[PDB]
Design a protein around this ligand. Structure first.
Ligand SMILES: Nc1nc2c(ncn2[C@@H]2O[C@H](COP(=O)(O)OP(=O)(O)O)[C@@H](O)[C@H]2O)c(=O)[nH]1
Ligand code: ALF
Ligand SMILES: [Ca+2]
Ligand SMILES: [Mg+2]
Lengths: 751, 331, 315, 44, 329, 53
């Protein structure tokens, strides 16, 4: 994690011939990035600037990977080198992305611009930024987007806070600016101390005016050093942590918060923080809902491959329904650059005039993609965002002897070095020795294929030859027999892939044994062939028994894919999560369908109270907030949901009881989901937090859309109380352990 | 240092003996034969809406007609209690505004805030610019068109000059920040209440204190006078009021009620001297009897905090300007 | 059978080090690839143990012998402790120039007035050999690292006739709400009292003596009716540190009821056992006590042999 | 620092030569002011 | 040692400019009755371009002109009868300049193809190829010498009879946006992206002086028709008027209703004006002495990207990014 | 290296510049514009006889 710095060739910009294919309009623009790393802006064809949001860039490819022009009028006007092209592909979902074809004019300022802009699109301190940063993004979007005369149009400010255009047309008249629906503000006269004041006359806040009556700021305007330091040590302080690992704040330490957040100099001169210095602090860089050591690549990455929730996909190539959609190669690049580590490939037998294998769902008339471009998509983009091993779940339907050699030479020449041909010398393919780690395979691409009708076409694939099976070393599928005849075989490299409605008869019949299978071997689970509209099963139903390769259709982002793209955002967007300790120790055994707390697993007790919201909707509607928790089946039985919005627009305030999830049995598996809607069912935003890392006290949740990219303006304000669990038989005999001296001083006094 | 503490502190033991020597009667021993007021209800009239953020003070006029309503967004609006019309809507370069006033001649209006300046206006533009404090300003009142007494957060009450723009007298003697003051109806003296749980009686023609009062356990959040000028009452922060008597120099009564935890924000008497209103940070505006220590009615329409209060000169209206920008007027 | 043993006791009492001892004695010991994972923790331990002296210095209001050696204080004062992976050239000549200072050596004797780990007289005396680039940590460098335990960790050890499940728990005041999830099916409670903590105050509470908290915690553990059919083995850790210490710090200053001889480590070591085995409400129950030392492996061997020999013959 | 102690000594010197009127002659007059204004009460 | 010697010599110039700043021009121009306001009505408008016009250069006899657009057309207009006299389809669609010869028979046009083309009045005569960046201007001296200015911080003094550089005027740190010549054609000046006008010679070949004072690029430069001063125009909405003698700026044409950049400035026939064409689509006519505005030539629906006043000084002509050259008189 | 010597050898050529005062240069600009204002067809308006447009 680093702050997103902007290189000095990026700021002050370069000169790009920005072309297109639809309109086929070629233009010479100059590209700048603003000095915080927020927007990529360039002047238009009619002298108004445009702003690509950098935080919504999927990829920035260049060189021989970039989008070549097709129109012979535009191949001639660009000068056709091919090492200058730069394609900045952005978009909100992987299914409907929007390209942006540039072309450099100097010698190789495109390999620089396409790398120092991809490091700002994949920055874990920009996507997880504070709330006072997402209000300097909605301010840079107003300073940048000027009209022809070099001045912010007032028809743009009303088009930002577009719920009440009478509270926006009156806040502008109180700060002194022009407030006509056609007029224009000069950008020197819209400084950040004016936009901060303009947001204060807009949004009346009685949520943050109580947070100050509760901590004892009853009278005078200053909140002292002592009250603030008792606030950050007692309310905002996670009560599951050591008091020696993370020590509480000392007065030497809660005084660089005053010198960072205080605007006044007669208050900061002593040690007294004003109220505006407090409301600057609640959305500060410190007071975030998740700590910075929960998002960087910090898990133990050396345990065997059988002990990791690997991310997955099922029929990755389709962009639509499973029956008559359109299959494209781009859903290999957009899946893997999201944190996917198990793609599917349905390699089918090619035609007589050119024997070349292609990819389609079998016998359903979907369009076809060839294998040589699919493998060049997988090889290009695999280790761009996470250096951890990609598994290619082949489905060999090719019954031609002359084409298995073609698909072997394709795998051996396109991947080349990064294909795990030969087994590692440390972990041989012997009965008993386990699978490697993600660190013994950092940068290896492992094929998955056989060696020597709820499923659809997956149930009948051909027997492999000696030319394709020789790349299958560790991950190898084999026909399932039972569990007892797979635990006396004791081979920790073989696997067997389940369909969903036949793993639902092994998840319920024997879930004691189906964890202990997955402590040693792998398992892949793909949705059944009745879901012909590209819908998903819930993966946390199948992650309770520790199944790793849970395959999900990356097309339709329903609730299952808002989960599978929100819990694999942790571990540094690496696509590898670590199983909890009781599902990867071969001695400890436990039931996933349990109803009590497990002996050795510390429980927790969550209490989320949703207080208010900021700028949630773009129209005057009512807004409700759903709060769910996913986990073991004894944690998911609570799905709370607030009443609809009762406060004014730009700031709904809910008066709801705190939602108590009192007994989380395994809190290193459970994950909380806060999804704010509109009345009628429209999505607005959601955030998926884990329970084992979410802090306590009055925090800002900065909401995200359905693919977990940050929404700029919307946010909630919740109050969480994540403490430990103490059972009902002795909740006072865990008070005799915290303060034992006074407990015995009471016991001898009561004699 | 401690060689003079033997004399300076035995006077603090003498000053309790002198005040306990005269306290032979209380209000419950004289006003037991005083008939009660019953219940006093009031109905909301003419909610002067129009502010964009929190109202922080108000002050009436002498002819019971106009009232300044300072806001937290830089807007001194001079409302009319009859017609609900913004007679002026004077903007400010200052955002944080914590005080306002209105001259007895009606042609001047003051201001203040965290920016240390008491900007007296003219009646539209800034007439004089009053700098000279070193902390945040809290309450400013007018003696006349040529003198203003301000009370800052740098432990200073200050009697100024309007035309030139310099302090003609500075009163120190407090320890903590001075939260409010209130002039006397004779205007030969005034009083002031501060963050060190003290309230001192000054003198405007001399320049120094002459009586100091204690009894509260936290800040004095605001303060006001009995209408004749021979007793004065305060708010507090531990949800209690008082009534000190300047002819006896000792506290007389305390307006504490059970199930009242949220503290005072402003206190203002009536024109008959009989109802002590009080603001509260539990969103209400409760009314006490001044002579029997018992409540007499709730004035509850607001939902955010109540920041200020005041009857007019004739005692007709009660303008309770809350924190939710709606300045209700009761009768 | 499989038997479950709890390791209960307060913080910085050397419970993990007892787990490392059982990993050396009765398990897979530290091989060559296993010690090299500790070479960052010794450097971070030296940095934290040196910064704690620097802050206490400014808090103990004293001056450094040399201002040239005062200039070496800020170079170690600004190090990000968690991001330390190498022990390079300019950092050896800071902490190697601050330790021969007579002022800091004078500060070191007043370590009862602040927080400093009890393994800084073994790391800042091998420091001429830790600064070498060809560093592999010895096993006593491994048994003295300071890694503060959080949560609750389990540990099984095959003793060739039974299997003991040591439960390594946390030790602070914020780690005693997690012990509740290991009270089911206990067999014995190995309490770990640090003998040489009679004159230091707690980390989270700077007023209460650390020997009273263990004396208090131990009163509570054996008075549960939950631990009524489970044997209690008391271990008196750090028995050496209370042999080099008793010579300058007396037990009559911190526990006034001490009626034994002065400047005798064995008398205070005998008195702690009287102060603990007389914390029994029942006259019938007995507490099996041993004076241990969690870094001396030959001390832990016979002690744990006696502990196995009495736990299996109690069952 | 001695000047502040000297000013704090000299401030309470003028708090001693002040004649005080008894509370029986003060609360009675405060009640006589409030019984004599039952015709100018707009809030009752 | 050399940085100390550079920053010590860079302070001798500031006190020297302070000593020669004896009485500024704004003070001594207070005894002149101003021009007031000049009103120019659009007399001709030339259509025939299909895309954004990037440059122009008025002829020497003040009657014809030549313009260049991105659709690969260099058209020569007759500014009396509005007739396309010639139209040259180019070998590259990207131009950034054009020029017209003082003899009146050659036309140069270089662009992003890094190569200055020279046409005869048809077919291209020479092809001046040695540059490592995009060409950004060119102005003829006569039928043999042409002073280009690329975007690799250089200039040139090409000899078109052999196509090789007589001189090369290196010395900037960024792109030489646009030059200008002199009335004697013995000196010239140049701009930059370094906020730094420079001045050179055409025989000695050395950077003779150096002027600074802006805050962003220099996008265009003119010359005083006396030959003794010039004036730039920047990307920060500020024209100046530097001098050759005092080596310091003399006025500054900027007032704060105007924020967007400048694209081409040009003086009048007597030099008592300064026509500057902004990016708010208008071409404000500053008074060259009092630095107050004296008109607005608001006629264009897109960004104005060229100007130029005739040799006689009769009528000015501008041309914008909506393909229309309008001749304001 | 070569930049460090060519910059100081160019700035050493910025010494011997014989400059004429701003009050004289401004007077010469005013002597130029107010002597050639007769010829300019943009300061004074032109008659429509000689105007070709
Ligand atoms: N000298 C000495 N040090 C010891 C002994 N036992 C433990 N220590 C040290 O005490 C320190 C703290 O023990 P620690 O592992 O942190 O216990 P924990 O925090 O409760 O898990 C360790 O570095 C041990 O080396 C002992 O018998 N003698
Ligand atoms: F104090 Al510990 F493990 F008990 F760090
Ligand atoms: Ca398939
Ligand atoms: Mg431990």
């Amino acid at each position: 994690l680093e702050p997103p710095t902007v290189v000095e060739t990026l700021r002050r910009g370069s000169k790009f011939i920005k072309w297109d294919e639809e309109t086929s309009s070629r233009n010479l623009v100059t590209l700048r990035v603003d000095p915080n790393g927020f927007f990529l802006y360039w002047t238009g064809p009619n002298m108004e600037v445009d702003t690509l949001d950098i935080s919504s860039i999927r990829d920035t490819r260049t060189g021989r990977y970039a989008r070549l022009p097709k129109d012979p009028k535009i191949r001639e006007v660009l000068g056709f080198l091919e090492e200058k092209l730069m394609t900045v592909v952005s978009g909100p979902d992987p299914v409907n992305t929007v390209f942006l074809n540039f072309m450099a004019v100097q010698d190789d300022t495109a390999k620089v611009w396409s790398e120092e802009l991809f490091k700002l699109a994949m920055n874990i301190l920009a996507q997880n930024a504070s709330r006072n940063t997402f209000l300097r993004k909605a301010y840079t979007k107003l300073k940048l987007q000027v009209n022809q005369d070099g001045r912010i149009p007032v028809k743009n400010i009303l088009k930002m806070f577009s719920a009440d255009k009478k509270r926006v047309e009156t806040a502008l008249e109180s700060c002194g600016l022009k407030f006509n629906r056609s007029e224009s503000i000069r950008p020197d006269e819209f400084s950040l101390e004016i936009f901060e004041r303009f947001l204060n006359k807009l949004c009346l806040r009685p949520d943050i005016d109580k947070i100050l009556l509760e901590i004892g700021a009853k009278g005078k305007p200053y909140l002292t050093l002592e009250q603030l330091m008792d606030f950050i040590n007692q309310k905002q302080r996670d009560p599951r942590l050591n008091e020696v690992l993370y020590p509480p704040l000392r007065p030497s330490q809660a005084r660089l918060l005053i010198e960072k957040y205080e605007p006044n100099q007669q208050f900061l001169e002593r040690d007294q923080m004003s109220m505006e210095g407090f409301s600057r602090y609640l959305g500060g860089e410190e007071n975030g809902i998740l700590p910075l050591e929960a998002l960087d690549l910090s898990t133990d990455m050396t345990q065997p491959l059988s002990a990791y929730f690997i991310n997955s996909s099922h029929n990755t190539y389709l962009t639509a329904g499973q029956l008559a959609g359109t299959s494209s190669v781009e859903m290999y690049r957009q899946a893997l650059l999201w944190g996917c580590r198990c793609v599917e490939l349905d390699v089918w037998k090619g035609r007589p005039p050119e024997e070349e294998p292609f990819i389609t769902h079998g016998f359903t008339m979907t369009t076809e993609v060839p294998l040589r471009d699919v493998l060049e998509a997988i090889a290009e983009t695999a280790f761009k965002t996470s250096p951890y091993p990609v598994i290619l779940s082949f489905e060999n339907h090719v019954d031609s002897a002359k084409q298995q050699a073609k698909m072997a030479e394709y795998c051996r020449s396109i991947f080349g070095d990064a294909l795990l041909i030969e087994p590692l010398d440390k972990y041989p393919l012997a009965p008993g020795v386990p699978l490697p780690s993600p660190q013994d395979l950092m940068g290896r691409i492992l094929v998955k294929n056989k060696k020597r009708t709820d499923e659809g076409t997956a149930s009948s694939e051909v027997n492999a030859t000696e030319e394709m099976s020789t790349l299958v070393n560790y991950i190898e599928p084999v026909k399932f027999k039972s569990f007892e005849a797979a635990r006396k075989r004791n081979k920790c490299f073989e696997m067997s892939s389940f369909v969903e409605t036949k793993a639902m008869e092994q998840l319920t019949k024997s879930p004691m044994e189906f964890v202990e299978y997955n402590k040693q071997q792998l398992s892949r689970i793909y949705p059944k062939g009745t879901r012909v509209d590209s819908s998903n099963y819930m993966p946390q139903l199948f992650w309770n028994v520790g199944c790793q390769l849970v395959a999900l259709n990356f097309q339709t982002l329903d609730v299952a894919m808002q989960l599978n793209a929100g819990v694999f955002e942790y571990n540094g967007r690496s696509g590898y999560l670590l199983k909890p300790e009781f599902m990867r120790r071969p001695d400890k055994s436990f039931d996933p369908f349990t109803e009590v707390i497990v002996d050795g697993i510390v429980a927790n007790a969550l209490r989320v109270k949703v207080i208010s919201g900021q700028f949630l909707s773009d129209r005057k509607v009512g807004i409700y907030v759903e709060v769910d928790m996913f986990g073991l089946p004894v944690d998911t039985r609570r799905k709370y949901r607030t009443r609809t919005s009762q406060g004014n627009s730009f700031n709904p305030v809910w008066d709801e009881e705190p939602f108590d999830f009192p007994k989380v049995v395994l809190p290193t598996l459970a994950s909380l989901r806060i999804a704010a809607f509109e009345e009628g069912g429209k999505f607005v935003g959601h955030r998926i937090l884990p329970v084992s890392a979410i802090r306590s006290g009055y925090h800002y949740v900065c909401l995200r859309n359905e693919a977990n990219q940050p929404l700029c303006l919307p946010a909630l304000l919740i109050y969480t109380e994540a403490s430990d669990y103490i059972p009902d038989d002795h909740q006072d005999y865990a008070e005799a352990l915290i303060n034992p001296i006074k407990h015995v001083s009471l016991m001898d006094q009561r004699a | 240092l401690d060689q003079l503490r033997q004399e300076a502190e035995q006077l603090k033991n003498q000053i309790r003996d002198a005040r306990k020597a005269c306290a032979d009667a209380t209000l419950s021993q004289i006003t037991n034969n005083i008939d009660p007021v019953g219940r006093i209800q009031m109905r909301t009239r003419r909610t002067l809406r129009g502010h964009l953020a929190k109202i922080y003070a108000m002050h009436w006029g002498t002819d019971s007609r106009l009232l300044v309503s300072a806001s937290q967004d830089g807007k001194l609006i001079i409302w009319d209690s009859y017609t609900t019309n913004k007679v002026h809507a004077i903007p400010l370069r200052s955002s944080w505004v914590m005080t306002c006033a209105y001259a007895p001649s009606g042609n001047y209006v003051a201001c203040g805030g965290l920016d240390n300046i008491c900007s007296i206006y003219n009646l539209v533009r800034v007439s004089r610019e009053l700098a000279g404090h070193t902390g945040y300003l809290s309450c400013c009142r007018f003696l006349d068109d040529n003198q203003i007494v301000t009370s800052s957060g740098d432990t200073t009450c200050a009697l100024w000059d309007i035309e030139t723009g310099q302090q003609t007298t500075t009163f120190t003697g407090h320890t903590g920040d001075v939260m409010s003051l209130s002039l006397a109806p004779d205007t030969r003296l005034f009083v002031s209440g501060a963050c060190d749980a003290s309230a001192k009686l000054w003198d405007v023609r001399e320049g120094m204190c002459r009586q100091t009062f204690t009894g509260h356990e936290s800040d004095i959040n605001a303060i006001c006078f009995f209408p004749n000028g021979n007793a004065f009452a305060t708010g507090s922060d531990d949800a209690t009021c008082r009534l000190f008597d300047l002819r006896a120099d000792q506290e007389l009564m305390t307006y504490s009620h059970d199930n009242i935890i949220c503290g005072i924000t402003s206190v203002s008497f009536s024109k008959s001297g009989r109802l002590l209103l009080a603001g509260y940070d539990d969103f209400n505006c409760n009314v006490w009897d001044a002579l029997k220590a018992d409540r007499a009615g709730v004035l509850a329409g607001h939902d955010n905090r109540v920041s200020c209060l005041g009857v007019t000169d004739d005692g007709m209206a009660v303008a309770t300007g809350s924190w939710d920008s709606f300045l209700k007027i009761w009768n | 059978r499989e038997l479950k043993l709890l390791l209960l006791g307060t913080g910085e009492s050397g419970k993990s080090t007892f787990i490392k001892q059982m990993r050396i004695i009765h398990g897979s010991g530290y091989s060559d690839e296993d010690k090299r994972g500790f070479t960052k923790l010794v450097y971070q331990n030296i940095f934290t143990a040196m910064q704690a002296m620097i802050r206490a210095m400014d808090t103990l209001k004293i001056p450094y012998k040399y201002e040239h050696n005062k200039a070496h204080a800020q170079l170690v004062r600004e190090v990000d402790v968690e991001k330390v992976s190498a022990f390079e050239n300019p950092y050896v000549d800071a902490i190697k120039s601050l330790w021969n200072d007579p002022g800091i050596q004078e500060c070191y004797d007043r370590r009862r007035e602040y927080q400093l780990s009890d393994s800084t007289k073994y790391y800042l005396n091998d420091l001429d050999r830790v600064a070498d680039p060809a560093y592999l940590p010895t096993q006593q460098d491994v048994l003295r690292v300071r890694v503060p335990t959080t949560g609750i960790i389990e540990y099984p050890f095959d003793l060739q006739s039974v299997i003991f499940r040591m439960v390594d728990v946390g030790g602070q005041r914020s780690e005693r709400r997690k012990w509740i999830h290991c009270f089911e099916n206990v067999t014995s409670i190995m309490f770990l009292v640090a003998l040489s903590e009679y004159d230091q105050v707690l980390v989270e509470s700077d007023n209460e003596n650390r020997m009273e908290e263990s004396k208090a915690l131990f009163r509570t553990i054996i008075t549960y009716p939950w631990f009524q059919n489970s044997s209690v083995i008391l271990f008196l850790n750090k028995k050496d540190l209370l042999e080099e210490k008793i010579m300058y710090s007396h037990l009559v200053d911190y526990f006034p009821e001490y009626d034994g001889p002065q400047r005798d480590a064995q008398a205070a070591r005998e008195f702690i056992l009287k102060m603990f085995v007389d914390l029994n409400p029942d006259s019938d129950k007995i507490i099996y006590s041993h004076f241990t030392c969690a870094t001396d492996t030959e001390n832990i061997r016979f002690v744990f042999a006696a502990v196995k020999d009495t736990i299996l013959q109690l069952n | 620092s001695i000047a502040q102690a000297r000013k704090l000594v000299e401030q309470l010197k003028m708090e001693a030569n002040i004649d005080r009127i008894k509370v029986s002659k003060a609360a009675a007059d405060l009640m006589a002011y409030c019984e004599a204004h039952a015709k100018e009460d707009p809030l009752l």
